[model samples]
Target: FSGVVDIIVVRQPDDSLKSMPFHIRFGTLKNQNINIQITVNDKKIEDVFMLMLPEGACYFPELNAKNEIQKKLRPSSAILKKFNLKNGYNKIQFIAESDLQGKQLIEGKIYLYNYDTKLVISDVDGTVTKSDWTHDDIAELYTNIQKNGYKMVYLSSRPLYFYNYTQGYLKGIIQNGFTMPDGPILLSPDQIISSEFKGALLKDLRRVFPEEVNPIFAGFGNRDTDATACLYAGVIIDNIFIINEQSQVEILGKQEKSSYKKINEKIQELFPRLP
Candidate 1:
């Protein structure tokens, strides 16, 4: 299929609300170059940005084998700019030329807020919800963490297609009125190594903050990739929590927390008092 795949935008931490990053993914139309148009608040920003879909392999840890990643024809565009965004919600749209000779339009909403120094990086699939864990428990945990002044940043091995689905699931579980303005749900590209991609993102996140004003980071994951990425990102081992899948003598009780209750308790203890 040829059309807009997914678009995600997050407000930057600076004083200027107009500064934000836009992530756009696309599919090939007829195996040819696709033209995309960007619009914000009903005004045209860019008329055309040509993109070509490239094929690649995506890894799946669950299968324990490499499988053909979904969306064979995938391409992405990243744009960071300062725009005229209002205080609350803003609408951004992407219009792309389709494979069958038509226009495909996709819309995304972004909420802007004042920046905070504390961040919690979490994995979605098995870390937050999968088996035994109830959505209520996840909700309570996130709500409490937010109450303690941490912003939620969800990083997943899944593709961009799962962004809205995962966000909705989290929203339903989290209490109402909680806002994630500075944090965005980041997804890996198709067929890319999960650990490398996640690790690089963590490194980039750390690089953005000044050395003197160190931002407190805590990561939660169930896979080894999650543990590896957090450590690579420079998150303290004590601040990293894993949900054990198999009993490992060293990791079983050392860094693994069986239930969300224990996980939340540990996170609460690690949460630093912000100025």
Candidate 2:
């Protein structure tokens, strides 16, 4: 579907990183080809590609107020590609043709880390942050976890439009000692429910990592949807620690007034050493 182009980092292979663009559509743009230009380190590269819009569904729930299900013809295609990167931070830029032949530019950073580091998939609301404006003890907990060499991945059911806002909030926490994860923070589509969307995302994450590695070591959430998604993704039930009990399936843990201290303690008890 075609508004602002969203580039999502998908995988980190041994030699390269994989990403794809998710174009948002506001209206029908027929028979148009999107020209994509890639740039690395401030210099434009010759790796340009053209993607033709295919007929697809435009089921954006935010646009529909009547709670009615609707579908519109739009351009929805995946231009997945891999790029060579260094060991640290790599600057990458993307320029693409927008609707009405307009040009739009979006840039993102790729961070490479040791492949042995474990991942913690966490929910933003309730589980980590108490609210949109309040972070509580989550910042300290995230800092401690990262200090122990584990990577953090924040997953939220918020719409893509909130990506920048969410990133800013996370950045503020990091300034106070929290460590951001290697991958991009994941946001769900406006039309998809949290349970289904997060479940599929977790499954895809498992598919990306090697079987022997098993990057996902633990999961943290405060909602039933998060618990269900993590379990569906094949995370062990014992590793699925929740802040307050959402369902009978989750491991019951004590949550302090200011933070998820009890949950964090459980995680430490389970994985005393980092992977």
Candidate 3:
């Protein structure tokens, strides 16, 4: 059996499909007690039916339509709430019946306790690649979060000789979407200390922001020296995501794909989500 007090669903469609009414329905097995609060965009919803299925495994046989068996789904919130649910894996499904199928959809997060954690994503080179793949997509993702008030800082291990040029490049990319609250910290040959030196510098910074001790996210040169510097900076080797750096191609490539997949799986364990 399932236990749930309510369920909420939200749908956001792109401009091309704005005219169609979107329908979404979801429910858990009967007899389990669950308190569900669904939000779309930023609005909280009520009026959902409370359910308690009989004591046993429950199934909904009425959902099959057009000879299609309902494709079971586990919403993000439901997965997070499973830790508290009496009967875990209460089968739930969501269906969208709409004439318009292709649209850009945007919605607020389903999980609660959202916070504003400042992030530092730094590049080792200019936005365009003479070598490395551009960080445009990652930068855009950061921009989306910035709209909600999280802080970001872009640091560089580039030489101070290119300070102005580098600043110009970063501005061209981020002006329209994201803003770095502090001056970019550029580590030139003179500014960079050895691994021991960097360790001390980071230790001081960590002491200042005890709660924000996670190492900054960095994109570096493929060279061993550059990668080693990142390790000394406290970024776990697995956390040091590598991007494609070959000539001509601008893609994540296989190496980056694998590293990112592994890194993302563990990101929640290492750092708390920003509010």
Candidate 4:
């Protein structure tokens, strides 16, 4: 409760991420007596010195850490840190780029101390009735969240026509001692404005609950489409985990190695939040 910690999202630069440096301009400190700290992936990154920057002064730090840059922009739901605040207006700027390669980036903003209420947990293929993995694990996660005093929302890109089967499966889970807030939302097959299925699904969620803007904890399986969709949706990359099937083949059959788990896990870990 030192003060509100605000997040500013910035895209990665199109240079070699290995050597590129990113800069962040944290807004001015009001009291000038506060301590500011930056963290990623549950790891502390920087200590801010409010006395250095003059009032209304915005400065950028050159960051050549590509992995670190991406981590700050799309971090895990469980990852965050705080800093002391000044009285007046202050801004932070993150500059991401190196002397090497280049790539696209996604950006957004978040305010610290926000009430994280409902927990939206989604299964990629089956929860909505497409039927991939058994609903056992999903049911477990839903139950865990409910016990922790958080509402659950199931998201699936499957068409709404299969609602009955999805509902039945969900009901069976609940009957078997698993808990879920409500039935899943079967997303449309037709791509929405965001050019991706998951994006469309996220849009639907935001549209449904315009005022309740809470952090999302998404769990998805392997699927290039799902990966792209989640990326476009500005989802916290760590919050979106990809079940690795190859390393742990027992969970999914041995044949479920290629596109499903490998690609998904590679994406998740590769883009893991910086620590």
Candidate 5:
């Protein structure tokens, strides 16, 4: 088997999304550049020459001299600003190299939904229990959500370059038995992986779906910024679940329960169930 190359799906399809965007960096490494070919499904974006992907820089002055890797910095990361997706599912692959026998293919997935799609934004780490153990209740709650027609997007603040580790980290959650439904896992772009950006990103949800057909139904996260983001997307106040180090699902800071057992019961009766 050839070593795998990964594609980080930076832009998710908004309700009316026709053209998609993607970026490929040097395998989660910072500021490293290389040549690679891109294909959304089977069509080659850079059909001829191997595209150049030299990632962004580290923002420390002393490191410019002190650090060997940071010595040569240039702006790079392969991004195809717009590509179309079919109605339901989409796959994107990045070909690092190919020989006569075979080539390494690392793929990424996305699902497109109409205005009536229900959504639950979930963050990895802290909220989804932890690396060592999986919470069956949390797993089933997502299953229940998926069963009831809500789609779960595992959204996180981890930087895009961290895609190499991020893929395994989330998969590790399921390996232990957390059955998170099939949906795109979106990480932050090269920028902040930052807190404020979370709010801004959530704000975009409002751009497509109107309040009567609200797609954002619930949210699960470990931080206050996430708590705020759920609101930014107009998720009802009660449906916001924030797990502060396994204490309880909270909103800005009032406890719902210490475990998902209590929240799972509330799902049917609570939340804005789309028609």
Candidate 6:
């Protein structure tokens, strides 16, 4: 309730170490003031956020398009900048000190793309597993993709208010052996229809990743709308894949019901292993 809720950020094209700003983080702390009010109850995420190049710290001033940080001298606040991040998945850790929850550490990730990095975007929910939550070989599938040195991004159409909870859910599945690689989780801020917001959100995401720079090499989803988001995001039609309720994968332009074991080899071939 009283940990990191938000942060104010600025970008100054400085040295190689301070050149880029990939800052976007928020999480629960356990107190009223720090939880960042989603309503009158104050449920926003604030506190200290850090990039995992090591274990570092950045301050949070809390973004207010309304701008209260300057006049009131915002008491508990921060701003993160001036750090070098490596290519691939960079872990973001949130540290919050509180009266009730004590000190909490919630981890997240932001992917930095180099010239060699290719991104594979995915839809969670019905796509990663069936209705029964059965994830067959995707844990290892994602494992090799990471090993192959590709970046990943997982998208969910869930409401923005549940963002931190959704992050925990994915982490829980990974701990249970699902092993979806750690990557940024994008949630919709829709106050209403979520499906209508994904494409809109995905479009905004492109400005950050930019196609000619960090092109999406592949996409995975179970629904047509999912494919639409991917396609509109510039992922090739042939590169997008779909998984059905029976656990079979459907490769675009090819076939359906393809067993995971059979197609796994194809995956390894397309995404060759590297030392």
Q: Model 5: per-residue lDDT, tens digit, 1-275?
A: 11222222222344233222233333333212333555666777643223323432121111334555332111122223443545445676655553432444556664556666677888876777553154457776777777777777776666554555756765655533545566666655433321176776565444545445666778888777777788868787777887765446665435445467766677676543545
Off by over 4 Å in 4: 1-116, 124-135, 174-176, 179-186, 189-195, 207-214, 244-275
1-275, model 3: which lDDT tens digit per residue?
11221121211121110000111222222223432233333333333222212432222222355876332232333333332222111223322222333211222112111111233434445323334334434444444434434333444555433544655665556533544332233333243212123334333323323233453433333444444555666556644444444322121222344322333344454334555
Estimate the Cα RMSD of every predicted model relative to the unseen true structure.
9.3, 8.7, 21.5, 17.7, 8.7, 8.9
Local distance difference test values of all predictions, in order: 0.52, 0.54, 0.34, 0.36, 0.54, 0.52
Using TM-score as the measure, the top candidate is 2
Model 5 clashing residue pairs (backbone)? 54-76
Q: Which ten residues in a row have the lowest lDDT in candidate 4?
A: 15-24
**Model 3: lowest-lDDT 10 consecutive positions:** 14-23
Residue 186, model 1: lDDT of 62
Candidate 1: residue pairs that collide: 57-191, 58-191
- RMSD over all Cα atoms, model 1: 9.3
> Which tens-of-lDDT digit does each residue in 155-207 have in candidate 4?
55544335445555655555255554442333343511110555665554443
**TM-score of model 5 relative to the true fold?**
0.64
- lDDT tens digits, residue span 194-233, model 6: 1167787666555444336535678888887778888888
- Candidate 1, residues 6-58, lDDT tens digits: the string is 22333345542222223444434333445656676787764234343443111
Sliding window of 10 residues with minimal summed lDDT for model 2: 72-81
Better of 1 and 2 by TM-score: 2
- Alpha carbon lDDT at 174, candidate 4: 52
